[PDB]
Design a protein around this ligand. Structure first.
Ligand SMILES: *[C@@H]1O[C@H](CO)[C@@H](O)[C@H](O)[C@H]1NC(C)=O
Lengths: 178, 14, 189
C-alpha cells in the first residue's frame, strides 16, 4: 500500500493558504505562494519530475472562494484551537563535535499557524535553519518540522519554542547532550 | 522531466 | 490575535494496492475541523459527511460531467502521478545506520538498557530484534516506534533491559527492504 495526497488549505482572516503533495507522510513539494514557484522537499526530486505553479495558485483562489461560502453557510462557526505536541530530537545519534541536526516536531494541532524559534543557550539562532510547511494528518490536523543544524557539545543547551493560539504561554522543549 | 497533475477540485454551492 | 479563524482544507487522496492494480481515489473537503463532503471511488458518487455538505453532495451527482470526471480520477490523476513519483518515492530505498550503545548504564553488572539506535533509513518498514548469545530476547523491549524525521528518513530505538555479566554477547538484528541479509551489530560485556 501507498498514499499520495494533494493537500491544500486556506485560512481566514489571515489570508494564507498552502498547496502541497504528500507521499506516505512526507512532503514531495509545496508551492511557494510569495514567489509563485515549485519547491521540492529534496532537490533531486526536481530531476525526475516537474509541476506548473500557476495551476496551484488557481486552486487556492477557488479554496478561498469555498471557504467564504462554507463560513457563511455555517453561521460563522470558528475553529477550535488545538495546541501542538512538541518534541526535540536529532536525526542521527549524537557524536560530540561531529555535525548533527536538531529536529523540532510540532504535532497534532490546528489551525496551521505557529511561531517557532530556536534558542541556543537562551539566544535565538536565526542562521542555518529550515522548516517544513504544514503537513496534513489524517485526523484533520497538522504536523510541522523545524530543523537546526548544530555541532554537539557539552557546553551548549538548546530549546525549541513553539507559540500556538491553543497554548496558554509559549511552549519550550529542552535538549542538551545528556 | 515529467509533469504532475493537480486536481482542480469543485466549487461549492452558493 | 484575538479574532476567530476559518479553515478550508481540501484533500485529494490516492490509495494504491498491489502496486497499482487497485486504486481508490477520495476527494475530501474539511471545514475547520469537520469533514463536510467526500467523493469515494469505491462508492461512485459524492456523499455528504455532515449536514454542512449536503447542498454540494446534492448539486454534484447531478452534473454528469462532474461525476464522469470524478470517476475517472483513479486513471487521469492517481495512476498517472504514480508513474511520476515512482522512481524517487515508491522505489526510494536508504539503508539504516545501526549503533549499539548502553543507555548511560556504565555500571559493571547492574541493571542496564542496551540501545539499538537505527537511523537514517527509508522506507519505514523495519524490524529490530535483540539476541542474547544467539537466542532471541522477546521480553523487556522498550521501543520508540517509527519516528518520521520529515526529511524522507526515519529513526527508531529498541532498548533491551538486561543485567550484563562478563562473557555475554547481545546482537541487534535489523531487517529493512534496503538490504538482502539482515544487518547485525553485536555487543560484548
Ligand atoms: C507570532 O508572532 C507574534 C507574537 O508577538 C504575533 O505576530 C503573533 O500573534 C504570533 N502568533 C502566534 C503566537 O500564534
Amino acid at each position: 500500500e501507498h498514499v499520495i495526497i494533494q493537500a491544500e488549505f486556506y485560512l481566514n482572516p489571515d489570508q494564507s493558504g498552502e498547496f502541497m503533495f504528500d507521499f506516505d507522510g512526507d512532503e514531495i513539494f509545496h508551492v511557494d505562494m510569495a514567489k509563485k514557484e515549485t519547491v521540492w522537499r529534496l532537490e533531486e526530486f526536481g530531476r525526475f519530475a516537474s509541476f506548473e505553479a500557476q495551476g496551484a495558485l488557481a486552486n487556492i483562489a477557488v479554496d478561498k472562494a469555498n471557504l467564504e461560502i462554507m463560513t457563511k453557510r455555517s453561521n460563522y462557526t470558528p475553529i477550535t484551537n488545538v495546541p501542538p505536541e512538541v518534541t526535540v530530537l536529532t536525526n542521527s545519534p549524537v557524536e560530540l563535535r561531529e555535525p548533527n541536526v536538531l529536529i523540532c516536531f510540532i504535532d497534532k494541532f490546528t489551525p496551521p499557524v505557529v511561531n517557532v524559534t530556536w534558542l541556543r543557550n537562551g539566544k535565538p539562532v536565526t542562521t542555518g535553519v529550515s522548516e517544513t510547511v504544514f503537513l496534513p494528518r489524517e485526523d484533520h490536523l497538522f504536523r510541522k518540522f523545524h530543523y537546526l543544524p548544530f555541532l554537539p557539545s557539552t557546553e551548549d543547551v538548546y530549546d525549541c519554542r513553539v507559540e500556538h493560539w491553543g497554548l496558554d504561554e509559549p511552549l519550550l522543549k529542552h535538549w542538551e547532550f545528556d | 522531466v515529467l509533469g504532475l497533475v493537480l486536481l482542480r477540485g469543485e466549487n461549492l454551492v452558493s | 490575535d484575538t479574532r476567530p479563524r476559518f479553515l478550508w482544507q481540501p484533500k485529494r487522496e490516492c490509495h494504491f494496492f498491489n502496486g497499482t492494480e487497485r486504486v481508490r481515489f477520495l476527494d475530501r473537503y474539511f471545514y475547520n475541523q469537520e469533514e463536510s463532503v467526500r467523493f469515494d471511488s469505491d462508492v461512485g458518487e459524492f456523499r455528504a459527511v455532515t449536514e454542512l455538505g449536503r447542498p454540494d453532495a446534492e448539486y454534484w451527482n447531478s452534473q454528469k460531467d462532474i461525476l464522469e470526471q470524478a470517476r475517472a480520477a483513479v486513471d487521469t490523476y492517481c495512476r498517472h502521478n504514480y508513474g511520476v513519483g515512482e522512481s524517487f518515492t515508491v522505489q526510494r530505498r536508504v539503508q539504516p545506520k545501526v549503533t549499539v550503545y548502553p543507555s548511560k548504564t556504565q555500571p559493571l553488572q547492574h541493571h542496564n538498557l542496551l540501545v539499538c539506535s537505527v537511523s537514517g533509513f527509508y522506507p519505514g518498514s523495519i524490524e529490530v530484534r535483540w539476541f542474547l548469545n544467539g537466542q532471541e530476547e522477546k521480553a523487556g523491549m522498550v521501543s520508540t516506534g517509527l519516528i518520521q524525521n520529515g526529511d524522507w528518513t526515519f529513526q527508531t530505538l529498541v532498548m533491551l533491559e538486561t543485567v550484563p555479566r562478563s562473557g555475554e554477547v547481545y546482537t541487534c538484528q535489523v531487517e529493512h527492504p534496503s538490504v538482502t541479509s539482515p544487518l547485525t551489530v553485536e555487543w560484548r560485556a
